[PDB]
Each structure stands twice: as structure tokens, then as C-alpha cells.
Design a protein around this ligand. Sequence first.
Ligand code: HEM
Ligand SMILES: Oc1ccc(Cl)cc1Cl
Length: 137
Amino acid sequence: GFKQDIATIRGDLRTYAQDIFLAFLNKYPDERRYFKNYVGKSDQELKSMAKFGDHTEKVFNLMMEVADRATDCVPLASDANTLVQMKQHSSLTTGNFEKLFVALVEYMRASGQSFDSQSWDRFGKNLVSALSSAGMK
Ligand code: HEM
Ligand SMILES: Oc1ccc(Cl)cc1Cl
């Protein structure tokens, strides 16, 4: 279920984080504009860049913390507020977050694996509502 999925992802965080983030940029290539140092770089060039692995791992570490603190895939308002008030997220809208979660669920459905992809879709929908409520356009 969702709790096991958090354990699965955490066990190999850097690989899942890189694979899901690339799946996101591949599905929505205009989103790469927010990551100016990743434009025009192949996947293997990205993996040679320290900050690509560091910043993907830390994004997914936080995502897993927010997922773990949720009740029945409903995140804490405090965690939504953290994501809205981050300087790095100042120009984002809830649509950016929805795209990441559409890509994450598509990755889980395409994987070998028994992810609870309905729960990740729900968690994403609930996190979008919490982000709006915390003031994200
Ligand atoms: C639940 C979803 C997300 C979480 C948990 C999250 C978390 C984070 C974290 C922890 C950082 C700082 C990483 C570090 O300094 O090492 C970060 C930076 C950033 N995030 Fe997010 N983020 C999320 C979604 C998004 C989305 C949807 C976008 C844009 C489409 C975005 C754009 C960025 C950008 C541009 C940075 C700074 C890039 C950099 O300096 O490397 N994030 N995010
Ligand atoms: O390194 C990252 C991976 C995913 C997302 Cl959404 C943002 C950042 Cl900075």
C-alpha cells in the first residue's frame, strides 16, 4: 500500500527520485525551463552534475516526509505551507505540482511493480488542494 511505497522509494531514494523527475521533464518538457542548469543536458550529463542528484534526492526526501506524515493520503497544512513559502517555488502554480504527480503516477503504473498508484494520485490531488489553500495560485 501507500506506506510500503514510501519504504520502497526510500530504500533507493536517489534512483527513484532521478527516474521520476526525468519522467516528469520528459512528459512536460516545457517544465525544464524552471531548472536552467538542466536545459540542453542529456540524462547521463545530468547524473554527472552533483546538484542534479543532490537536489532530486532532497526533493523526494521531503516528498516522502510529507507522504509519511499524511493520514489516509491527506497531507498536513503545515507541510503544504512549507512548499508554498520556499523561495525556489515562488513562481509556481498548483498546475506544476499536478504535472509532477501525473508523471509520478504514470511512472508507477508503467513500472514492474505493485505501487498503490491510486493512493499517489489521491495524495497528489489532496496536496494540490492544500497548496491552493496555503495561497499558491
Ligand atoms: C511535492 C513536490 C515537491 C517537493 C517536495 C519539492 C521540494 C524541493 C526541495 C526540498 C528543494 C530544495 C532542494 C535542494 O536545495 O537541494 C526544491 C527546490 C526546487 N524546486 Fe521543488 N519540490 C516539489 C515540487 C516542485 C515542482 C512541481 C517544481 C517545478 C515545476 C519545483 C521547482 C523547484 C526548483 C526550480 C527548485 C530549485 C532548483 C535548484 O536550485 O536546484 N519543485 N524543491
Ligand atoms: O531537483 C529537483 C527534482 C524535482 C523537482 Cl520537482 C525539483 C527539483 Cl529542484
